[PDB]
Amino acid sequence: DMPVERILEAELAVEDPVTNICQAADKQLFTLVEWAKRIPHFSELPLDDQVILLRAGWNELLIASFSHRSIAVKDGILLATGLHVHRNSAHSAGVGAIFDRVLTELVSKMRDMQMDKTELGCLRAIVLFNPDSKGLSNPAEVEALREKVYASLEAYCKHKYPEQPGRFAKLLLRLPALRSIGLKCLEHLFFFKLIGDTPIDTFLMEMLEAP
């Protein structure tokens, strides 16, 4: 069983610029572990697989969250530290293009369809329960949990938005953009680490270590 009310409760429970952005991400990694614990059946998975899922999904999970948090922001994002990053600042740090992708493919699309916190929660749980993650001891159990989240999401959408039959598909079709954006953000992060002039705190650093 996978109740959207429990998923929503999980979301509501946890509520230069590059340095600030790295600080914010590290801070949210701690909060992400707490969120994952509150998603039904996640804690019941083997500890090793909980580790694999969070290492594989953390970046997309945190990008999804700050993107939705930033819907009321004009041409920018709100970080978990309370700091704002705007287009001008991102451009001036040499990361304009990827920043614009986030705004156009995530923040604005979330704003325009008025994605609610239940929908965001379920999208994140779908991302969390990724059966493609390498080294999972039981991919089928993870896949079964993903299936239960999206069956639950679909029913929620059709109940709450009965005249938007394409809504459920539209939500899931943000996931390729999120995948793509996550990969590019991670690529930048490894470069920041390579140069060594940006403070990267311990939990973020741990996520960067090699399997």
């Binding site: 701690f30 909980q50 580790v51 969070l54 741990e206």
Partner: peptide, 10 residues
């Protein structure tokens, strides 16, 4: 991955 294991256990 020490921090993740620690936070998930407790």
């Amino acid at each position: 991955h020490k921090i993740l294991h620690r936070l998930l256990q407790d």
